[PDB]
Structures are given as structure tokens and as C-alpha cells.
Design a protein around this nucleic acid. Sequence first.
RNA 1: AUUCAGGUGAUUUGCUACCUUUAAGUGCAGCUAGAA
Length: 162
Amino acid sequence: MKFYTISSKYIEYLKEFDDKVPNSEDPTYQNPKAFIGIVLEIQGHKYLAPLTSPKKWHNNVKESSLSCFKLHENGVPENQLGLINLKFMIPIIEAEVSLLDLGNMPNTPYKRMLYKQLQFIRANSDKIASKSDTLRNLVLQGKMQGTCNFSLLEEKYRDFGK
RNA sequence: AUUCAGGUGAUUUGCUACCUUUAAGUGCAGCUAGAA
């Protein structure tokens, strides 16, 4: 798994079908909204899932929740690092997506945080792929709401631009 | 941005574990000190 960004035009396109697809453009954003890399690959679809910085309501989400994978520094549980917002993962196409360039990124606190996350994610990368698969299944069966319409997105995301 | 999926313990507060391939109750607190 790796960090990605997603072209604004592609986010805009999907937003047309499901208004829950994560926002890309925002003036509060210091860095681009970062997505986490191939969280689930099934039936030809590859999903990326948006990372999100900590909010107040995060304390209430259970570790067992299918909607989020809470992130923290390896072996320092009190160093919370936001969460992978699985409920808003989206299918992608290689063309409209590009890896963060960690190689050439100047050393900033942000880059340092990126690496604390990368390690925790890599370490728990089976759990994360397993939550995703289950979350998708429940949504497709109608048992869960509040998420991206996977069934719909999976039907339209390959058209673009026609 | 998008402000908590449902379920598993002859019992179960909180968190955690577990299971959603129709399967699943572990751990630490909590309360407890009962009698074959």
C-alpha cells in the first residue's frame, strides 16, 4: 500500500453520480487530500480510500467498525494519526491517479507523519484489506448505509470522458 | 466535508477480542468473595 492523489476532474465526474465521493478541492487544505493505495482489488476494480485527519467524533468509533480503520503510531497508541475513511473509498483508473513523490518531497513534519502512517498501515495491511472486502459486501447487500454507492460507482467509473 | 453497520456470552456496564464466506464472547477493568 502507498499514498496517492486523484485528479480533480475524475473526482468531479464521480461526484456527479454519488455526492459522497470525497472532496478534492478545498482552501483549508494545506496539502492535497491523500488516498491510501489499493485497499481492495476485486472483480477488476481497484479501490483507493481517503485518509482523514482527526476529528472530535473519532473517539466514538469502535476498533471493530467497518467504516474506519483508526491509525496510530506503532506501539504508541496515544499518538493518534487520523483514520482511513473506508466508507468513502472509490474505484479508480490508473490514468487519473498518481503516487505521492515521497522520493523528492522536502523533509517536513508532514512527510514525517506520512511515514509513521506508512509503517502502521503496512503492518496492518491484511486487516485493512479484509475490512474493505467485508464493508463492500455489506453495502452491496443493503445491510449498511452512509457509504459511497459502490454498486453505482462500479457501473459508471469506466465511462469518463465519453 | 460527509458527525458510531448489524450480530456472537443460559448472564454482560465500558472498552477490546471475535464474526458477517449465516458465523462469532477472548483480554483488561467493573461489580463481586456467594458454596456443592
